[PDB]
């Protein structure tokens, strides 16, 4: 039916760049908040 | 044989422990810091930080 280990591909390829963007945004927001 | 072997293995290990204790204390008493670190001249405080 549906090939396995594609769940890993879809979920990791969704998570890792999302993780990267969330980390960047939180880092930038905290740097702005500390600038004040 | 079991009694002699076990007793003398016990005593050999115990006297290795004694050797380590007395060799360490002999070195520390010869160098002169067997009673603790001198507060006035602490050797670590005069060293560069390691990281």
């Amino acid at each position: 039916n549906v090939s396995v280990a594609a769940y890993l591909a879809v979920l990791l390829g969704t998570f890792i760049p999302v993780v990267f963007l969330l980390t960047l945004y939180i880092q930038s927001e905290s740097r702005k908040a500390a600038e004040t | 044989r079991s009694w002699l072997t076990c007793a003398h293995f016990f005593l050999g290990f115990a006297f290795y422990i004694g050797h380590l204790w007395h060799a360490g204390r002999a070195r520390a008493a010869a160098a002169g810091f067997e009673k603790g670190i001198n507060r006035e001249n602490e050797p670590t405080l005069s060293l560069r930080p390691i990281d």
């Binding site: - | 002999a26 008493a29 010869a30 160098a31």
Partner: protein, 45 residues
């Protein structure tokens, strides 16, 4: 079998390497004072 040596070629490094280390150590020791002291250890280096 002394020191686990079955081939005579094994004796060459076992004897040779300590000789070179002893040569370096002997240079170090010839740099020293080498007279008797009355203390628990020698503070001269």
């Amino acid at each position: 079998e002394a020191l686990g040596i079955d081939d005579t070629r094994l004796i060459v490094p076992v004897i040779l390497i300590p000789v070179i280390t002893f040569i370096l150590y002997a240079g170090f020791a010839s740099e020293q004072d080498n007279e008797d002291f009355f203390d628990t250890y020698d503070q001269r280096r």
